């Protein structure tokens, strides 16, 4: 899209660094920074613990630009069909991350911004409504942050 101002992107770098440094001491720049951080850590951990699980999955898929969406939809729908919970939410994220990594390995970088859009929409319409009813983003932070 169109370029923004040098001034806005300097602020964003600054807020990013301070966020990180605050969170290292158990403080947070905001609820968003705290969530971001807890989720990065939850994801590293989930992926470390269940890497064979990922190995099985993202082969069995065979992603291509014309099938990437169908694969995403099938996995995501079965992940949440009988309920949302915080662990399944983490798995959703890790799954989308692996799907993006795999797209770039196979030189289908075009799929990365698409997968982001599909994840963001699904978070907006299905996942955050559950979270709003089940303790909020703060509960996620108290459970997976620190």
């Amino acid at each position: 899209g169109p370029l923004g101002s040098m001034s806005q992107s300097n602020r964003e770098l600054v807020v990013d660094f301070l966020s990180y440094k605050l969170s290292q001491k158990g403080y947070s720049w905001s609820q968003m920074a705290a969530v971001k951080q807890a989720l990065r850590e939850a994801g590293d951990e989930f992926e470390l613990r269940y890497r064979r699980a990922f190995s099985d999955l993202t082969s069995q898929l065979h992603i291509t630009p014309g099938t990437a969406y169908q694969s995403f939809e099938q996995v995501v729908n079965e992940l949440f069909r009988d309920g949302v919970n915080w662990g399944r939410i983490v798995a959703f994220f890790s799954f989308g991350g692996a799907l993006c990594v795999e797209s770039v390995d196979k030189e289908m970088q075009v799929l990365v911004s698409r997968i982001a859009a599909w994840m963001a929409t699904y978070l907006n319409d299905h996942l955050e409504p559950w979270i709003q009813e089940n303790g909020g983003w703060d509960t996620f932070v108290e459970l997976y942050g620190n």
Binding site: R49, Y50, R52, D56, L79, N85, G87, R88, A91, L143
Partner: peptide, 15 residues
Amino acid sequence: XAXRXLXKXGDAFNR
């Protein structure tokens, strides 16, 4: 499969 995997191994991770 690698579904009721990513199921059991989300459900293990759930706090």
